[PDB]
Design a protein that fits this description.
The PDB classes it as transport protein. With 329 residues, this protein is α+β, with helices and mostly antiparallel strands. The protein has eleven helices and 14 strands. It binds fe (iii) ion (FE).
């Protein structure tokens, strides 16, 4: 069943990918799916490599799936992550704004505060919050990156160009686009908040639970709700910025190996899915969080035949992104 060339971003993911390869070989027969690992410094290099037929698959944050669809890449989503539980699979999650208790400010008082984002172009960390704050940003609002930099009084926006928009990396110099940057991703943005670098972290509903095991510690944090009030972190269903689509594995439109990608991942979730193995775990890792797949994922679901990015994401989310680039107040 041939080999799937997986694209790992940076060393932590590369290590998890090698383990994935090794463990799959020990359980899957020389007749089944195998995994090869291609290491890149950023997801952008992964999209390039896959379009150039040098790699086959990579799991992309949903907000990045739309971009990957554009030419000359035209990658398509083939396998989606799902969350919650196997009994009731959720193909969406909640974007929330975590803050520290007693910090004294609401959503409409974010101007001048310091922000921690999962990464530029990502759903919860960027598209949803910046989409909501768009008109609050000072003019000229284009380029958006600078308008955001001027709005806050220091930020960490992984993957943003620190040369053109220096304040966007004030909280994480260089704005590294990988786990090499300790403040990259959901847990990285949260650490940026915990460490006291930022005042707010735009992450998902499970993020704080993934980083603080004791409720007493979580009680020192809160969420910013859209009605300009705050609520406990366990009340995200009644205090979130929006619901967004699951992250998805993408592949080429031509000779993309989506059939083998699904076969690989479907067998992988049975052998190494949640609570399945004591040797290897697809959804966790001793090397870090959200490596290759999100830790909050509980399994995979195959994307319908030939579905493209726009259709996968849905009209509501697609409109948001488009309205982020355009915008009018
Ligand atoms: Fe996300």
């Amino acid at each position: 069943d041939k080999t799937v060339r997986w694209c790992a971003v940076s060393e932590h993911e590369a290590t998890k990918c090698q383990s994935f390869r090794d463990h799959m070989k020990s359980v899957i027969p020389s007749d089944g799916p195998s995994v090869a690992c291609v290491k890149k410094a950023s997801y952008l290099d992964c999209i390039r490599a896959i379009a150039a037929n040098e790699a086959d698959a990579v799991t992309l944050e949903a907000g990045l799936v739309y971009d990957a669809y554009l030419a000359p890449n035209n990658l398509k989503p083939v396998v989606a992550e799902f969350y919650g539980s196997k009994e009731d699979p959720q193909t969406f999650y909640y974007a929330v704004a975590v803050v520290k208790k007693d910090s004294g400010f609401q959503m409409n008082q974010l101007r001048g505060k310091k922000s921690c984002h999962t990464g530029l172009g990502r759903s919860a960390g960027w598209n949803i919050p910046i989409g909501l704050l768009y008109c609050d940003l000072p003019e000229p609002r284009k380029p958006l990156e600078k308008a955001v930099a001027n709005f806050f009084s220091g930020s960490c926006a992984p993957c943003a160009d620190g040369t053109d928009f220096p304040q966007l990396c004030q909280l994480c110099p260089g704005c590294g686009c990988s786990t090499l940057n300790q403040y990259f991703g959901y847990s990285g943005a949260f650490k940026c908040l915990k460490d006291g670098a930022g005042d707010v972290a735009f992450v998902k509903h499970s993020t704080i639970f993934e980083n603080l095991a004791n409720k007493a510690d979580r009680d020192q944090y809160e969420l910013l709700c859209l009605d300009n009030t705050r609520k406990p972190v366990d009340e995200y269903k009644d205090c979130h910025l929006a619901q967004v689509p699951s992250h998805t594995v993408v592949a080429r439109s031509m000779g993309g190996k989506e059939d083998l990608i699904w076969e690989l991942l479907n067998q992988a979730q049975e052998h190494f899915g949640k609570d399945k193995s004591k040797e290897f775990q697809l959804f966790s890792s001793p090397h870090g969080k959200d490596l290759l797949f999100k830790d909050s994922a509980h399994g995979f679901l195959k994307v319908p035949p030939r579905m493209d990015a726009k259709m996968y994401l849905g009209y509501e989310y697609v409109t948001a992104i488009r309205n982020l680039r355009e915008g009018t107040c």
